[PDB]
């Protein structure tokens, strides 16, 4: 299986582990993990975070042929589990978390979108447009020990976590771009830039 292969001590996650558009797994709803976690489920989260750190290291990214990322969801590794990793550097980190069974439990009426649009590791093309998301979210998740965390996010952090949670729900960023008018600005939409 993908999880068995990826969680080998010797394995570093790279672009060859990341599935692309068209793979049914990206459109499937991922399964909740149960507690206690298996060693493999813990290792997977750790490997995913290591991938993000490698992708953000210019030297390592070059050596490994990585595209830079600030989030990764297990379904992108062909693993249909509700596990995501997020690593947003402060422009060392604005947000660093491995989240098991993450869930948005509250959100703002206000919407937000990145002014520069969104990119995705499983998408090898540019898809222009404002990706409309909630401006602010409250997120519950469990850590590797099964301890519950409840955090509040705004700005970039909020965008990134919503993007990754979408993956575990079979949703892609362009699903949230206005079809007819990709750069439309509705009342109540904050453009982040």
Ligand X SMILES: CNC(=O)c1cccc(C)c1Nc1nc(N2CCN(c3ccccc3Cl)CC2)nc(N2CSC[C@H]2C(=O)NC)n1
- Provide the annotated binding site for Fe cation: 120, 163, 167
- Give the count of alpha carbons within 13 A of 52, CB side only: 23
Q: According to the 3-state scheme, what is the secondary structure of 62-86? A: HHHCCCCCCEEEHHHHCCCECEEEE
Q: Which of 25, 56, 80, 101 binds ligand X (CB under 6 A)?
A: 56
Sign of CA dihedral 34, 83, 172, 152: positive
Q: Does residue 120 bind ligand X (CB under 6 A)? A: yes
Kindly indicate which of the ranges 41-49, 74-82, 119-127, 140-148 contains the residues binding ligand X, using the contact rule CB under 6 A: 119-127
Q: Does residue 99 bind ligand X (CB under 6 A)? A: no
Which is catalytic among the residues 41, 164, 179, 193?
Answer: 164
Instruction: List phi, psi (to 5°) of 141.
Output: -160, 170
Q: Does residue 165 bind ligand X (CB under 6 A)? A: no
Residue 113 CB contacts under 8 Å (≥ 6 apart), including other chains: 130, 131, 132, 133, 159, 189, 190, 191, 192
Q: Which of 119, 155, 170, 182 binds ligand X (CB under 6 A)?
A: 119
The secondary element (H helix, E strand) that includes residue 40 is helix 39-55
Q: Which does 114 bind (CB under 5 to 8 A by kind): ligand X, Ni ion, none?
A: ligand X
Q: Does residue 95 bind ligand X (CB under 6 A)? A: no
Say whether 193 is catalytic: no
Active-site residues, by number, are 164
Contacts with ligand X, residue ranges (CB under 6 A): 56, 68-71, 89, 114, 116-121, 126, 159-160, 163
């Amino acid at each position: 299986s993908a999880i068995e292969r990826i969680t080998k001590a010797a394995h570093l996650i790279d672009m060859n582990d990341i599935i692309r558009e068209g793979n049914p797994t990206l459109r499937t709803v991922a399964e909740e993990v149960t507690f206690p976690l298996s060693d493999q489920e813990i290792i997977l989260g750790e490997k995913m975070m290591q991938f993000l750190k490698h992708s953000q290291d210019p030297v390592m990214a070059e050596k490994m042929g990585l595209r830079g990322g600030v989030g990764l969801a297990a379904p992108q590794l062909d693993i249909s589990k509700r596990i995501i990793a997020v690593l947003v550097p402060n422009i060392a980190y604005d947000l660093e978390a491995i989240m098991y069974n993450p869930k948005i439990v509250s959100h703002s009426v206000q919407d937000a979108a990145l002014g520069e649009g969104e990119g995705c590791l499983s998408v090898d093309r540019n898809v222009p447009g404002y990706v409309v998301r909630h401006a602010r979210v409250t997120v519950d998740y469990f850590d590797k020990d099964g301890e519950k965390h409840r955090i509040k996010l705004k700005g970039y952090n909020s965008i990134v976590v919503q993007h990754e949670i979408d993956h575990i729900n079979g949703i892609m960023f362009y699903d949230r771009i206005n079809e007819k008018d990709p750069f439309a600005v509705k009342d109540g939409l904050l453009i982040l830039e």
